[PDB]
Amino acid sequence: MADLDKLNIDSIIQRLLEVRGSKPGKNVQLQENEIRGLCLKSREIFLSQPILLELEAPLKICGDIHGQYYDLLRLFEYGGFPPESNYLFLGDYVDRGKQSLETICLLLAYKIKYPENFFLLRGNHECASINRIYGFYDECKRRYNIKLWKTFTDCFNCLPIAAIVDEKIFCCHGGLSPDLQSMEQIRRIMRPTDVPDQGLLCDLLWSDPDKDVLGWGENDRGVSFTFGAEVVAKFLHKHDLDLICRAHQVVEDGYEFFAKRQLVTLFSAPNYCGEFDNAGAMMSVDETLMCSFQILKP
Amino acid sequence: NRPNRLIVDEAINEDNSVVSLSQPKMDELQLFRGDTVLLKGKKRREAVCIVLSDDTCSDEKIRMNRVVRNNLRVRLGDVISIQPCPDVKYGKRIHVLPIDDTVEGITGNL
């Protein structure tokens, strides 16, 4: 971004590359005035874009990084580091651990240097509240003070919500929703925003692509409305949609194609909580809307 | 007629939207130091500004700067009525344009 901001962005990129291929947990901190200016610029840029973004084909969209610096670095090394490749996370981009801050800083730096080669989203694990995602709020409270935490929360609330790949594949966090009607109210819903417990964005971030329901029902979050196969099919038919991205789940195969290859549940969460050996994967979207399952380590 | 038409005195401050109002002026009128009131000028010249609290800079006369007088098309000592202007909200899409005689020389996005 700015001269000091761009220098800090280059330094953070170099630090992440030096921490690439190694154990996760990078932080990538900064100064006080410089970080305040960078956060203000990032909030302004993210709020500048609409809630419904559009991807630039081709791109290497990853699954749920779960706030892992090692996973993000591996995706950058394999799927293409920024700004050499466009990245679009489906959701759950931040989670428990001290490695989500580095990924967020890298994404912000890439967007500042090239907004057409950087994108990320939040799900049930990367929510703005510590009730659903304490891997950010509690981490900031323990490490940093409250002013920087408030600035980060405001910047995150000033971010976009969804993305689309050539109007072919929907880059959603989880599954469909019964509350989502059209894009007119989505683009109208500007900053600020957050993942709720129930509704449409709540079902996108917390719920996953449901098949036991038809129009609406309960979800894994317990309050979300995991729209069933019928609701997703009706939404795709009305909106001429073909694919929807799913994340925020422990995928044993990483990338699962659901709804007859219409819900690519790509998840980049390797070894979720250790016990759940969830596989990592990415959605390699080519220039001709060719969705490929780029699996990764578990 | 009405007491609200206070004399438009001269303001020592160069701020355009600031009028040095007497303690009696700020008190008898509902004029706080941060009250956005509307002043009506000649030929339907209405504007909203701030009322500064300066008892020593006003004696029953609204000390107004020359910029304020020029913008409002009013002279010195004018009995200008002042009314509250709390309906002034943020504009949606306000069209603006510089003055050719005034933007002549200031190059770039001035």
Binding site: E44, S48 | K92, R93, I94, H95, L97, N109
Partner: peptide, 11 residues
């Protein structure tokens, strides 16, 4: 002269 058509001076 136009309204809400040019990119404005963002702060």
């Amino acid at each position: 002269f136009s309204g809400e058509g040019q990119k404005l001076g963002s702060l």
